[PDB]
Amino acid sequence: NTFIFPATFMWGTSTSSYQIEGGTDEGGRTPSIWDTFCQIPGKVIGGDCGDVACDHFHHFKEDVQLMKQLGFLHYRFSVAWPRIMPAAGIINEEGLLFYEHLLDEIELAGLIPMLTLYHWDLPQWIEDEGGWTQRETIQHFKTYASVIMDRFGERINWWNTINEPYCASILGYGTGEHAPGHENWREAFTAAHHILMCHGIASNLHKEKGLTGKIGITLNMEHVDAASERPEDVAAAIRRDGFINRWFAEPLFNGKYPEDMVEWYGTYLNGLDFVQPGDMELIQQPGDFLGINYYTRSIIRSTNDASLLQVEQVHMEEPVTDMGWEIHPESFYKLLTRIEKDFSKGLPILITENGAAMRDELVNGQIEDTGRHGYIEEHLKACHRFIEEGGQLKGYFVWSFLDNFEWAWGYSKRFGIVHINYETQERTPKQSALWFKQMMAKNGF
């Protein structure tokens, strides 16, 4: 009973610029939308902000070194837009420089990087103009994406255009739970449209520059189950499915929005007026791979409330993380299968984010995060069953190399395999991290 992964399975770890970097007002960086957002009372637990965070801006050389010794060959990070374009058309050399020195270390250590272009930290000066609700913002992204592709490109093996368009649009302008924090469904869908286009934008700039590195977008997807066999619950699950999965996957591989969902939104879509000629075509560019982020399945029931979807999420209390998320690895194998079947039916699948947050305690310099550990392994068994069965999964990046700013949850939630002591900023690998190093060694378990 062993699980040996492919010979070329890419193993790595992922992080995000605002979530770890710190150095918010250093090197010319100007405020991002989350710096404004974290300041609104009640938006983020304990009022935590991305101020300092893990301070990766100063400890990066050690962190990359710490990765190598940990056994990792791939590292996915993101570039802080506010660090590159602190203002309308200016290009901050000091910022392009930080990532350069970072890349030096990546290569010096002998690792293969994956640069994520957009990971929710939009420049506040851009949100001032209307942010993602304005087509013009797509032009500002083109500017940003070109600079980074020209300044590099000859050193990037994998390009990750947008990380989870669903969060940045639905949660950022619709539910108000992420930054900038608007509660307007007409904006959320307009924003989802514009961010989805920025994926095409970067994919075009990619072909024109003739870069050789791979390119793909990242969607957070979730397997959905109906709460009961009642017709309304089944309909409820369908809606939730199109809401998170189909509304972003459909345009990516089919060049269209889910018809059923388009109807359910109706008025809020304003008749798809935000869609201009050539937009859908621009958006339908799968690229060389499809990045996926998964954590747990959702159990859905119907309600007749005042919410957009009118769906309720049954809160499974059985085996859950410190975040209250159910631990159902079966659903991961199930979601991966459904992703191949539709949409990627062939195209390489890369798991750009998978992990869990548990309560961590130090026992004489070591953290026995048996819980987190069991979570990675079990979910890896699902990826293994997908493979072996014909699954095109070519990689897996454990989410959070280090504990970091967990958005609205702040620092209270730790996804790291490496412990961060925020009073001293010192790093300390968790048992789960040691387990991963051994695992990648034998390339299995």
Give me the active site residues, please.
164, 353
DSSP class of 83: H
Residue 321 lies near ligand G2F (rule: CB under 6 A): no
Instruction: Identify which of residues 81 and 399 has a Cβ nearer to ligand G2F in the complex.
Output: 399
Residue 21 lies near ligand G2F (rule: CB under 6 A): no
Q: How far is CA 198 from the centre of its chain?
A: 15
DSSP H helix total and E strand total for the chain: 16, 13
Q: Which two tokens stand for residue 182?
A: 């608007």
Q: Which of 326, 406, 416, 419 binds ligand G2F (CB under 6 A)?
A: 406
Minimum CB separation from ligand G2F for residue 17, in Å?
Answer: 10
Instruction: Identify which of residues 165 and 213 has a Cβ nearer to ligand G2F in the complex.
Output: 165
Residue 293 lies near ligand G2F (rule: CB under 6 A): yes
Minimum CB separation from ligand G2F for residue 176, in Å?
Answer: 17
Let me know: does 196 contact 247? Beta carbons within 8 Å: no
# binding residues, ligand G2F (CB under 6 A): 8
Cα–Cα distance, 288 to 14 (Å, whole number): 19
Q: Which two tokens stand for residue 3?
A: 């699980």
Instruction: Identify which of residues 105 and 353 has a Cβ nearer to ligand G2F in the complex.
Output: 353
Cα–Cα distance, 31 to 141 (Å, whole number): 17
Pattern 231-270, binding to ligand G2F, x per CB under 6 A? ----------------------------------------
Residue 399 lies near ligand G2F (rule: CB under 6 A): yes
3-state SS, residue 385: helix
Mark 370-380 as b/e (b = at least 16 C-beta within 10 Å): ebbbbbbbebb
Instruction: Identify which of residues 133 and 321 has a Cβ nearer to ligand G2F in the complex.
Output: 321
Residue 403 lies near ligand G2F (rule: CB under 6 A): no
Cα–Cα distance, 218 to 216 (Å, whole number): 7
Minimum CB separation from ligand G2F for residue 242, in Å?
Answer: 21
Minimum CB separation from ligand G2F for residue 410, in Å?
Answer: 11
Instruction: Identify which of residues 353 and 360 has a Cβ nearer to ligand G2F in the complex.
Output: 353
Residue 296 lies near ligand G2F (rule: CB under 6 A): no
Q: How far is CA 434 from the centre of its chain?
A: 24
Residue 353 lies near ligand G2F (rule: CB under 6 A): yes
Residue 16 lies near ligand G2F (rule: CB under 6 A): yes
Chain breaks in the chain (C to N over 2.5 A) after: 345
Let me know: does 171 contact 164? Beta carbons within 8 Å: no
Pattern 94-133, binding to ligand G2F, x per CB under 6 A? ----------------------------------------
Non-local (6+) Cβ contacts of 247 within 8 A are 166, 192, 257, 258, 261
Instruction: Identify which of residues 241 and 406 has a Cβ nearer to ligand G2F in the complex.
Output: 406
Residue 133 zone, left/alpha/beta (φ > 0; ψ -120 to 50; rest): alpha
Minimum CB separation from ligand G2F for residue 331, in Å?
Answer: 16
User: Which residue is associated with the tokens 């062939």?
Assistant: 346
DSSP class of 387: T
Let me know: does 214 contact 289? Beta carbons within 8 Å: yes
DSSP class of 267: G
Nearest to 361 by CA among 371, 352, 353, 351: 371
Residue 258 zone, left/alpha/beta (φ > 0; ψ -120 to 50; rest): beta
Pattern 413-432, binding to ligand G2F, x per CB under 6 A? --x-----------------
Minimum CB separation from ligand G2F for residue 116, in Å?
Answer: 9
Instruction: Identify which of residues 48 and 406 has a Cβ nearer to ligand G2F in the complex.
Output: 406
Instruction: Identify which of residues 163 and 298 has a Cβ nearer to ligand G2F in the complex.
Output: 163
DSSP 262-305: HHHHGGGGGGGTT--TTHHHHH---TTEEEEE----EEEEE--S
Closest-approach residue to ligand G2F (CB)? 353
Minimum CB separation from ligand G2F for residue 235, in Å?
Answer: 28
Minimum CB separation from ligand G2F for residue 293, in Å?
Answer: 5
Pattern 160-199, binding to ligand G2F, x per CB under 6 A? ---xx-----------------------------------
Nearest to 398 by CA among 423, 367, 430: 430
Q: Which residues bind ligand G2F (CB under 6 A)?
A: 16, 163-164, 293, 353, 399, 406, 415
